[PDB]
Amino acid sequence: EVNLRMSWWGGNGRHQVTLKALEEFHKQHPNINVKAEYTGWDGHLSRLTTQIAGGTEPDVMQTNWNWLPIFSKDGTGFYNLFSVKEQLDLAQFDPKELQQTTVNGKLNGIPISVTARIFYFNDATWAKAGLEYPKTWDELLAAGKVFKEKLGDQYYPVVLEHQDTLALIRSYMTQKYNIPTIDEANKKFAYSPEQWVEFFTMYKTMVDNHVMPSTKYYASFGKSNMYEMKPWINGEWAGTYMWNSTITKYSDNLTKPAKLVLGPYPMLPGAKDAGLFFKPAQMLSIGKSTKHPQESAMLINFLLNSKEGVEALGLERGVPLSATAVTQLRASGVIKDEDPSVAGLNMALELPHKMTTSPYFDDPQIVSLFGDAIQYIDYGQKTVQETAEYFNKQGDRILKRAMR
Ligand SMILES: O=C(O)[C@H]1O[C@H](O[C@@H]2[C@H](O)[C@@H](O)[C@@H](O[C@@H]3[C@H](O)[C@@H](O)[C@@H](O)O[C@@H]3C(=O)O)O[C@@H]2C(=O)O)[C@H](O)[C@@H](O)[C@H]1O
């Protein structure tokens, strides 16, 4: 008898397929039981952090790429998957993708899929507005006035949570200036004080121009998951800047026959880089101190490589990196080039994207600080100037703690 625990996050579609994969795995291995621990994204890292701090984390965990510095600065924070290569077919995964999940020579997770935030739009609402999807940053900014006037005050081209906004304005700044956002060598942000003023001024411009809800307006609804909010469901918030790897969590909640459709990616004339936040979407990792590394490795291999596991899991985590899995799903007609998640990935790959985001750009305290910052602007407690200086100062402080 081997008892394993596995955690993951996601929407209920992902919960469904994962649970069904676990029953097959157990059917194939009567001596191995897996206790499933799953939630939505909200608070998931917080809960795992508490487990790891106390040494009680699961045997198998779905993990995020920005968590590697948080838990595994020296690469020993998760079990070294090179040590279980007998059970786990590593050759299915591109070596450059494995490099992204390797730390000090130790393989900390198997990357499941890749992803980038891109624009997806509610086709029903945009048709009502009579507008085509923005092809430029100018058209995005201009869409807000059209939505507000043609459809009504409650209508917005997109909705953006603060993390989405942080990535979006970074993309714009990368297009303009072609420099990394984080200066990893000097453990600090790379932007001049002027560029930070520009960053927050763009936010203010977008809010003023009715592109997306302000934080104050968003709060007036304001606590469920974004994809479960009424103005999302009914099409009033007509788009999202979101991972292709989890786009059905969003599209599944729209009101038929509305669909989420892939939009253009705005590119500044003369930009050398799109400034995508492009990364491994998520990983499967093994607990550092698991008493069952081999059985844990068997479970990962089953989910990511086995015919039954791949079939069960389908596309709920995006387009598989595993060569056998992605071939299988194309062959079964599950992967369709016209599907917004697949099309979104293909568009992103063709965009010039040589700049790779630092994992510290997605440090959760940096992301939280950003939310506080824009809230200061929207609630009239700091000017754009004061907010920029505050973000630069407090962010550099967080980065120093994060990168120690
Ligand atoms: O495919 C995935 O599950 C995805 O998970 C991570 O992204 C999380 C979250 O799961 C995403 O839905 C998205 O979350 C939304 C907002 O962007 C976020 O700021 C927060 O408000 O919650 C929203 C939500 O719950 O849907 O973005 C999240 C994030 O980027 O942290 C991984 O990061 C991602 O790569 C992928 O595995």
For the chain, the structural domain boundaries read: 1-112+281-347, 113-280+348-404
- Looking at domain 113-280+348-404, which CATH architecture does it have? 3-Layer(aba) Sandwich (3.40)
Bridge partners of residue 119, in order along the sequence: 241
What distance, in Å, lies between the first and last C-alpha atoms of the chain?
41
Residue with tokens 């080039």: 337
Ligand 1 neighbour 6 (Cβ under 6 A)? no
Q: Is 327 exposed, middle or buried (0-12, 13-18, 19+ CB in 10 A)?
A: middle
How many Å lie between the centroid of ligand 1 and the Cα of residue 181? 20
How many Å lie between the centroid of ligand 1 and the Cα of residue 149? 31
Nearest ligand 1 atom, CA 280 = 35
Ligand 1 neighbour 359 (Cβ under 6 A)? no
CA distances from 375 to 135, 162, 205, 241 (A): 28, 9, 14, 19
Contacts of 270 (CB under 8 A, 6+ apart): none
Ligand 1 neighbour 191 (Cβ under 6 A)? no
How far is 142 from 205, CA to CA, in rounded Å? 10
Longest dimension (CA), the chain: 65
**CA-nearest residue, atom 8 of ligand 1:** 41
How far is 66 from 68, CA to CA, in rounded Å? 6
Please name which of 322, 160, 352 lies closest in space to residue 237, comparing C-alpha atoms.
160
How far is 49 from 56, CA to CA, in rounded Å? 10
CB 320 within 8 A of CB 310: yes
Domain 1-112+281-347 and domain 113-280+348-404, same fold? Reply is: yes
CB 363 within 8 A of CB 342: no
How far is 361 from 359, CA to CA, in rounded Å? 5
CA distances from 46 to 42, 52, 205, 224, 369 (A): 9, 10, 33, 18, 16
3-state SS string over the chain?
CEEEEEEEECCHHHHHHHHHHHHHHHHHCCCEEEEEEEECCCCHHHHHHHHHHHCCCCCEEEECHHHHHHHCCCCCCECCHHHHCCCCCHHHCCHHHHHCCEECCEECCEEEEEEEEEEEEEHHHHHHHCCCCCCCHHHHHHHHHHHHHHHCCCCECCCCCHHHHHHHHHHHHHHHHCCCCEECCCCEECCCHHHHHHHHHHHHHHHHCCCCCCHHHHHCCCCCCHHHCHHHHCCCECEEEEEHHHCHHHHCCCCCCCCEEECCCCCCCCCCCCCCCEEEEEEEEEECCCCCHHHHHHHHHHHHCCHHHHHHHCCECECECCHHHHHHHHHCCCCCCCCHHHHHHHHHHHCCCCCCCCHHHHCHHHHHHHHHHHHHHHCCCCCHHHHHHHHHHHHHHHHHHHCC
How many Å lie between the centroid of ligand 1 and the Cα of residue 130? 30
- What is the topology classification, in CATH, of domain 1-112+281-347? D-Maltodextrin-Binding Protein; domain 2 (3.40.190)
Ligand 1 neighbour 10 (Cβ under 6 A)? yes
CB 241 within 8 A of CB 159: no
Cβ atoms within 10 Å, residue 32: 18
How far is 53 from 39, CA to CA, in rounded Å? 19
**CA-nearest residue, atom 20 of ligand 1:** 161
How many Å lie between the centroid of ligand 1 and the Cα of residue 41? 6
Ligand 1 neighbour 82 (Cβ under 6 A)? no
Resolution in A: 1.8
Ligand 1 neighbour 283 (Cβ under 6 A)? no
Please name which of 339, 310, 334, 338 lies closest in space to residue 323, comparing C-alpha atoms.
310
How far is 309 from 149, CA to CA, in rounded Å? 50
How many Å lie between the centroid of ligand 1 and the Cα of residue 246? 8
Q: What are phi and psi of 107, to 5 degrees?
A: -80, 110
How far is 375 from 325, CA to CA, in rounded Å? 43
Buried-state track 237-262, b at ≥16 Cβ within 10 A, e below 16: bbbbbbbbbbbbbbbebbeeebebbb
CB 310 within 8 A of CB 7: no
Nearest ligand 1 atom, CA 245 = 1
How far is 110 from 122, CA to CA, in rounded Å? 33
CA distances from 191 to 173, 179, 314, 330, 388 (A): 9, 8, 41, 43, 11
Q: Show the tokens assigned to 358.
A: 């630092």
Whether cis (ω within 30° of 0) applies to the bond prior to 257 is yes
Q: Show the tokens assigned to 363.
A: 């440090």
How far is 340 from 346, CA to CA, in rounded Å? 10
